[PDB]
């Protein structure tokens, strides 16, 4: 048996569709399965995001004061309820928004972007900017979760957001105090200690932003470190269409799929 039988038995034991992408290094060959379907961002935008307010604006723009009132309150923002009062800077915005997977956080963080009815399509240039021509944001929070199975809106491919987060933490896509930034926040998330940081031993280093949603939406995207400090890119996307719009996430899904990767990535 092979790496693709081994992610078809996940896909019919969680009855699940599952995207993985592993894109190649000079030692290992890349590792895809479904890698050009699409899914559903879910949150997974967010890092990107971040990478696109940091990559127009100097780091002093970080300090600027957003403020916003709980009807901009409209989805999970678990850092931004609190700082409704007294706002939050960019800065602050770029940290929910990755490590609490902070939604109107994003939205705000939209907005900086592109402006209110500009902040989608303004993220969905800067992925152009980076040469994703496949990737597409078309909502945000809590909008984007309605969109069906099949729908092309508000979705992305494993080997699109793989190669993404490629760029911006192991490529140059953004100057290294900026880069350095994302990648503290991604190290610092507190969502994603279920999905590929399980898969991966303890001495591997691994930063990530997650996506959920539903039908059974889980995704997360990471970049890892092995113990003498060879990165790879992991990208593991899935959904249960199967048991509709509320079908359950099955985190440990991630788990697995990063733990077969793991196993190809860590044995020599
Ligand atoms: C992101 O997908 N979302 C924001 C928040 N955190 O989820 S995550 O950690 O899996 O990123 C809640 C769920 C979801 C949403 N529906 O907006």
Same mark, same amino acid.
């Not at 969502?191 to 590929?196: D, L, M, S, W, Y």
């Given at each position: 048996m092979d790496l693709a039988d081994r992610f078809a038995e996940l896909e019919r034991r969680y009855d699940a569709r599952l995207g993985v992408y592993v894109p190649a290094t000079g030692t290992t060959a890349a590792i895809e399965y479904r890698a050009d379907e699409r899914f559903a961002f879910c949150s997974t935008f967010k890092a990107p995001l971040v990478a696109a307010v940091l990559h127009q604006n100097?780091?002093?723009?970080?300090?600027k004061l957003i403020t916003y009132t709980s009807?901009?309150?409209?989805?999970?923002?678990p850092v931004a309820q609190q700082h409704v009062q007294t706002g939050m800077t960019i800065g602050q915005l770029c940290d929910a928004a990755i490590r609490y997977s902070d939604g109107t956080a994003a939205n705000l963080l939209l907005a900086d972007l592109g402006g209110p009815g500009g902040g989608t399509a303004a993220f969905t240039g800067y992925l152009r900017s980076l040469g994703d021509t496949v990737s597409r944001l078309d909502a945000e929070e809590p909008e984007?979760? %309605?969109?069906?199975? $099949?729908?092309?809106?508000?979705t992305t491919t494993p080997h699109a957001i793989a190669l993404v987060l490629q760029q911006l933490v192991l490529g140059n896509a953004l100057p290294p105090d900026k880069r350095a930034l994302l990648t503290d926040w991604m190290a610092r998330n507190?969502?994603?200690?279920?999905?590929?940081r399980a898969g991966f031993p303890a001495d591997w280093k691994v930063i990530d932003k997650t996506g959920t949603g539903d039908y059974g939406r889980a995704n997360d995207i990471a970049v890892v470190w092995s113990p003498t400090g060879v990165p790879y890119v992991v990208a593991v996307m899935s959904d %249960?269409?199967?048991? $509709?719009?509320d079908a359950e996430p099955r985190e440990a899904l991630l788990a697995e799929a990063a733990t077969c990767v793991a196993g190809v990535l860590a044995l020599e």
């Open positions: 100097p780091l002093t723009h970080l300090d009807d901009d309150i409209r989805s999970i923002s984007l979760n %309605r969109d069906p199975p $099949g729908d092309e809106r508000d507190t969502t994603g200690a279920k999905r590929i %249960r269409a199967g048991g $509709g719009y």
